[PDB]
Each structure stands twice: as structure tokens, then as C-alpha cells.
Design an enzyme around this catalytic site. Structure first.
Site, PDB file in Angstrom:
ATOM      1  N   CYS A 251     -30.838  13.174 -48.528  1.00  0.00           N
ATOM      2  CA  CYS A 251     -30.191  12.581 -47.372  1.00  0.00           C
ATOM      3  C   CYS A 251     -31.162  11.670 -46.623  1.00  0.00           C
ATOM      4  O   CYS A 251     -32.359  11.945 -46.505  1.00  0.00           O
ATOM      5  CB  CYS A 251     -29.632  13.666 -46.459  1.00  0.00           C
ATOM      6  SG  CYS A 251     -28.236  14.578 -47.290  1.00  0.00           S
TER       7      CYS A 251
ATOM      8  N   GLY B   1     -32.080  17.253 -50.188  1.00  0.00           N
ATOM      9  CA  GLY B   1     -33.268  16.582 -49.728  1.00  0.00           C
ATOM     10  C   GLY B   1     -33.209  15.067 -49.795  1.00  0.00           C
ATOM     11  O   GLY B   1     -34.065  14.394 -49.174  1.00  0.00           O
TER      12      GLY B   1
ATOM     13  N   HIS C 160     -27.426  15.146 -39.067  1.00  0.00           N
ATOM     14  CA  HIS C 160     -27.402  16.563 -39.464  1.00  0.00           C
ATOM     15  C   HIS C 160     -28.771  17.097 -39.834  1.00  0.00           C
ATOM     16  O   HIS C 160     -28.870  18.216 -40.350  1.00  0.00           O
ATOM     17  CB  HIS C 160     -26.384  16.786 -40.586  1.00  0.00           C
ATOM     18  CG  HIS C 160     -26.743  16.167 -41.906  1.00  0.00           C
ATOM     19  ND1 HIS C 160     -27.923  16.437 -42.560  1.00  0.00           N
ATOM     20  CD2 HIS C 160     -26.055  15.316 -42.711  1.00  0.00           C
ATOM     21  CE1 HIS C 160     -27.950  15.784 -43.711  1.00  0.00           C
ATOM     22  NE2 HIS C 160     -26.825  15.100 -43.831  1.00  0.00           N
TER      23      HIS C 160
END
Ligand SMILES: O=C(NC1CCNCC1)c1n[nH]cc1NC(=O)c1c(Cl)cccc1Cl
Ligand SMILES: O=C(NC1CCNCC1)c1n[nH]cc1NC(=O)c1c(Cl)cccc1Cl
Ligand SMILES: [Cl-]
Ligand SMILES: [Cl-]
Ligand SMILES: [Cl-]
EC number: 3.4.19.12
Lengths: 305, 305
Positions: B145, B143, B41
Site C-alpha cells: 500500500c 505492505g 489506513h
């Protein structure tokens, strides 16, 4: 979101850990530039620890009696001196992995990360606080002496603790990197009992702010209080007195959440008088006191290094 | 002595963390050999996350649309592919700090360390468990991820988790390093609620053994039980069923302490029925379940890396 007991990344300190052996005693040393720092009781046998005269025991030691090993490579010791309760072993090679660093003496209530090591090898990392009685509640086994505690500021490692001893009650005592013990403790296997381990009130309040930020709010009440009235309650519960300095430090968290500091004190006061009633806050059934206001701001904002 | 929630030393993983930016989305990637792993993503805007078709969104991307940055140095992407919910970005430079590593898919109840990162920079390290409902209770902000979870075995890093999402309830979901989500979760900003977060019984028992080893013993009782009888109690309290496999795994801790596994179960049964009565175990007022039997043996023996 979420709030965890969080230690600094340890890589910068892993690259500083070495093994120090003197005779039959092996523990850890901290290799910064061309100096290795370790507890002076490395020169002691288990017998000496009962009543050591460190100056006399040191007369019998020479540079070559201190075996320093970095991974699989031996370091050449070209000098040694005793500063308070640490030895400084001068080596002929500057640690190529030396980070930007400082030596700092922290106050009770301040937090830091510990890199537990054995034989100069990192075992694990965890977060601690200097307790009000100048002990720490760590995880240390025989051989972990010389493990260090530290904070990191972007790229500068502030070393604040070196592990030296375990008291009969299972708590831990150590020095700053200048070799001065925190509290009244001594590197001597004798009777030295810790005082009252009071709760770090300012840290509890910061952790309650962390909870509010993360959605745990059942404990917020309809009350406020004053510093004097709250401290009357804090005293009864063996909580450290809250000062205006603490209130000032909590300012930013107060601003972020819109909860006045004395209102949060009133909520804490009710938690102390009523208890948790089987509830939890951030997955804890007791009030956590090893997060500083800076730790909360750090973790809730995403500061990196 | 002492027992702390302890993460692995993170240095080996710090040297693998990079920043990945696609368009206006920036998160973390894991740089192993000449491949960077990150959540797919990264190609999504906040708008796409509502209903993404990742294959279609990927048609619009080329190697040069993935900006990979290691510290202050840009990496050249020479290929990209999607594997389940991760992207694998082939770079022209092998990470010189690549450790010995493996990719492993863990089971619920198993523990691991998380290195929380932002913009490819390490922020902190903490210990987690894969919950029985396949969430984890972490500390992740926007942030984070691409942050990974891992275990270390002497010198081999076993990567088991990559962070992808936060559910509306504030718990966290992610994938193994092959891009398969743990549990039924999807990288889609939609309604997906976690199931019952039961307690990891085997881990609680291991942590009670850790307590006995460290001097906390008020909870040891005069009783024993059977697996079937204990599990009847465990069910009522949303505890995972205890199997003979679990009993076998606790064998070494049973041997060290001389406390039979079913005796410790009987002690746990009373703790569940009676409660803690305001007491603590290893500084906790609730029964901790994110230490495995291996974690306890590791911390109580001093295994290093
Ligand atoms: O903690 C501080 N700074 C951090 C040091 C580690 N790096 C980041 C900055 C600090 N600076 N001035 C005062 C303090 N701390 C306190 O007054 C304090 C708190 Cl906040 C909690 C418990 C005890 C004490 Cl003394
Ligand atoms: O955890 C295990 N190994 C560790 C992996 C990390 N490196 C060290 C070895 C393991 N190996 N076989 C079975 C297990 N674990 C379990 O059965 C288990 C426990 Cl013990 C606790 C909770 C859930 C589960 Cl599935
Ligand atoms: Cl002396
Ligand atoms: Cl899709
Ligand atoms: Cl608790």
C-alpha cells in the site's frame, strides 16, 4: 495477490546510460566507473555493416572521434580498446552514479530486465528471457543498440546483455558485457537465421505454481507422471527437456503449494494435449515461459532493492 | 521492431519512495517537496479496518506518531492532515530528488506504470490500465500500500494512482493523489464487489495497429464495418463502446499503416466471432487491451525521457 510481468526498478541503470556518437552513428553506452561500454558497430556506417573488418575500421579512429555525452555534459575520452564485439571507452571521469555491479553471462531460459534507450536517454523498461535459440524477443528500434539487460540483487546490478542487432525475423541478438554474442550471431548484416524457439519448460512450471498461489487452479488435474514420460510429451510440443536440476529448483514452490513437481508436470502435459479450451491462466491464454522459479518466489514474497 | 508491455523508467519515482509506520502498520509513502503522501489506513490496525472512523482514529495521532524513513535516515514530521483517503505528512526537509510532477485523475482505459514497493523500497515495475470497472489488475502483497502509479512526459511525472486495497476477488483499488478512490470503493474491509470488467476496445484496436506495424497481419480481413454495427458486436462480447472520439484518437495509427479505423474494427469483429484458431498476435493468444494509442505511438517511435 496478482501476478504481473515485472521488471526490476531501472533507476540504478538509468544513471549509467550515455550517448555515443562516432561519425554519423549514434547509439547508447553504459558508463561504469571510468569506462563506457558500447557496441563496436558504432564505428560502422550503414554501408560497413554489410561486411565490416572491425580491426581495420578501428585504425581510422582516435579517442576524440568517440563523442560521449552524459545528459547535457560531454565526457573526455582518454583511451579506447575493442574487446570481442564491444568497445571500452576510457573517460577521465568516474561515473558518480556507478552502482555496485557485476558482469554475468546468463544461460538460455534465464530472465532479465531491459532498459530500452535512445540517444542515451531511457525510453522504457520491460522483462525478457534469453531464448533457447539465444535470441531475445525485445522491443528495439534503430538507435536502441547499447541498451542493456540486467538483474538486481538488493543493491548489486548484474549486467548480462547489451543489444546489438535485429534479425530479419524481428528477433534480437546481443552480447554479454565482455562483448561475446549469445548464440552464433555476429554483428554483420548478413543471413543468420534463428533456430527453433522452444518453450522454457521449467519457467512454465514455475508460472503454473504462481497461478496456484494466486487462485487460478482449474488446470490442476488428478494425474502425475515421470520425468521421462513428460519429456516424451515435451519433445513433441517443442518444449525444452526437464532435468532433475530443474525439479530441484522448483522444490521451494512445490513445498509452498503442496503440489509435487511431477504432479504439476502431469497438469502441464494435459494442458499441452488438450489445450486451454478458451480458458485463461493469470490472464494469459498461452503458457507463459519468461518467469523463472526465482522470479516467482521473488514476486510472491516481496523482495526489494 | 518488436512490441513489449513496457513501463516507464522508474528512477524518478524510486527517489520519492519512503517508509511510513504508525504504531504497528508499515506501508509506503510518496515524498514530494516537503510532503509525504500515504494511505490514511496507515493509522488503522487490522482490527480497525473492519469498520474504521478515520476522523476519530486520527484524534489519537500526533506528528511524532508517524515514523517516516527515507533509506536509513529518519524524517521529521512537522504537521499532518487528512485529505479524502490520503494523509499528507508535512516534513521539515524537501525531498532533494523531487522531480517535476503533477497530480492527475485518469479515466478508465488509460494506462500507467506501477512501482511496487515494500517498506519504502522499490521491488519491481510493471504496466497497468484503469479497468472500466475502476479496478486495476496489479501485483500487490501486504505492505505494498502506498505504491504509486504514474506516467512520465519527458521530464514531468504525472502521478495518477496510489494503492490502497485488494478486493476478495484479487483485483486492486486505490485513489488518485488527492485521495479520491477510483470507482465506488472504500478503504474499509467489507463486501464490495467489482462490476463487469469489459474490454477496452480502443486499446485493442491500437494494439492491432502495433501488430501490423511489427509484421503480424494474418488477422487483416477483406471487410469494413460501421461504428454502430461494430458496437452491436462489441456489446455482445463485453467490449466497451467505440466512440468517434476513439476513432479520432486512432487517426495517426490509421495514417501510418494505411488501414482505415473501421476496417480494423471489421478485422476485430471477425476475431471476436471466429476466435484466434490457435494463432497468436504479438505473442498473445488473447486480444490485449492495456496499450493505449499513445502507448503504441510512443513505443513504435522511440520517445525518451
Ligand atoms: O537463475 C538463476 N539464478 C538467478 C540469477 C538472477 N538473480 C537471481 C538468481 C540460477 N542459478 N542457478 C541456476 C539458475 N537458473 C537456472 O538453472 C535456470 C532457470 Cl531457474 C530457469 C531457466 C533457465 C535456467 Cl538455466
Ligand atoms: O490518454 C490520454 N493522454 C495520455 C495521458 C498520459 N500521457 C500521454 C497522453 C488522453 N488524452 N486525451 C484523451 C486521452 N485518452 C483517451 O481518450 C483514452 C484512450 Cl486513448 C484509451 C483508453 C481510455 C481513454 Cl479515456
Ligand atoms: Cl572483423
Ligand atoms: Cl470514516
Ligand atoms: Cl495470451
Amino acid at each position: 495477490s496478482g501476478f504481473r510481468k515485472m521488471a526490476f526498478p531501472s533507476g540504478k541503470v538509468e544513471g549509467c546510460m550515455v550517448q555515443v556518437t562516432c561519425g554519423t552513428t549514434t547509439l547508447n553506452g553504459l558508463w561504469l566507473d571510468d569506462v563506457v561500454y558500447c557496441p563496436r558497430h558504432v564505428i560502422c556506417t550503414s554501408e560497413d555493416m554489410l561486411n565490416p573488418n572491425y580491426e581495420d575500421l578501428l585504425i581510422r579512429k582516435s579517442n576524440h572521434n568517440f563523442l560521449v555525452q552524459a545528459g547535457n555534459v560531454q565526457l573526455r575520452v582518454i583511451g579506447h580498446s575493442m574487446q570481442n564485439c564491444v568497445l571500452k571507452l576510457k573517460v577521465d571521469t568516474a561515473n558518480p552514479k556507478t552502482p555496485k555491479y557485476k558482469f554475468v553471462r546468463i544461460q538460455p531460459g534465464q530472465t532479465f530486465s531491459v532498459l530500452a534507450c535512445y540517444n542515451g536517454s531511457p525510453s522504457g523498461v520491460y522483462q525478457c528471457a534469453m531464448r533457447p535459440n539465444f535470441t531475445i524477443k525485445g522491443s528495439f528500434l534503430n538507435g536502441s543498440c547499447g541498451s542493456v539487460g540486467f538483474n538486481i540483487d538488493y543493491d548489486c546490478v548484474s549486467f548480462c546483455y547489451m543489444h546489438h542487432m535485429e534479425l530479419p525475423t524481428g528477433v534480437h541478438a546481443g552480447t554479454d558485457l565482455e562483448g561475446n554474442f549469445y548464440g552464433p550471431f555476429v554483428d554483420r548484416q548478413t543471413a543468420q537465421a534463428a533456430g527453433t524457439d522452444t518453450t522454457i519448460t521449467v519457467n512454465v512450471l514455475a508460472w503454473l505454481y504462481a497461478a496456484v498461489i494466486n487462485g487460478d487452479r482449474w488446470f490442476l488435474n488428478r494425474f502425475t507422471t515421470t520425468l521421462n514420460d513428460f519429456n516424451l510429451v515435451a519433445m513433441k510440443y517443442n518444449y525444452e527437456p526437464l532435468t532433475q536440476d530443474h525439479v530441484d529448483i522448483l522444490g521451494p514452490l512445490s513445498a509452498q503449494t503442496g503440489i509435487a513437481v511431477l504432479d504439476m508436470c502431469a497438469s502441464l502435459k494435459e494442458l499441452l494435449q488438450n489445450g486451454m479450451n478458451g480458458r485463461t491462466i493469470l490472464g494469459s491464454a498461452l503458457l507463459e515461459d519468461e518467469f523463472t522459479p526465482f522470479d516467482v518466489v521473488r514476486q510472491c514474497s516481496g523482495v526489494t532493492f
